[PDB]
């Protein structure tokens, strides 16, 4: 089966890995979730894209990042920013985000061409998540995983 070998997601407040496409999803696929701002009066959010199986992004591999800006000032949790991950028929990942309130949007295509992990890196990273299952399953249950972005 042709699938993404690692979970794909974004960093949420506290450096938390928030999955959009879990590992072993059949390709092609498209998945969206809505996020909000992590602080009052926040005029932009950063979409920071990671691959890997760990609960904290410091232990996963960053693939890219971009911002959505021009968010009218509002309290924490009010803006609604829809984030889309799409792996196309060619296996290429495209991430986009849009502030539902303003229509302001941005996007980034993650090519398979540059600064990618090897098969052996990918193997090790999966093995790592079984190895630290108890540390991870615990810490995943500790952190506050609200879909809010810095």
Swiss-Prot record:
It comes from the Eukaryota. Residues 2-84 are annotated as: Substrate-binding (SBD). Induction: By endoplasmic reticulum stress. Disruption phenotype: RNAi-mediated knockdown prevents the formation of ER sheet-like structures during mitosis in the 1-cell embryo. ER accumulates in foci throughout mitosis and partially fails to disperse at the end of mitosis. It is found in: Endoplasmic reticulum lumen. Belongs to the heat shock protein 70 family. Endoplasmic reticulum chaperone that plays a key role in protein folding and quality control in the endoplasmic reticulum lumen. Required for ER dynamics during the first embryonic cell divisions. Specifically, controls ER transition into sheet-like structures at the onset of mitosis, possibly by regulating homotypic membrane fusion. This is Endoplasmic reticulum chaperone BiP homolog. It comes from Caenorhabditis elegans. The lineage of its organism: Eukaryota, Metazoa, Ecdysozoa, Nematoda, Chromadorea.
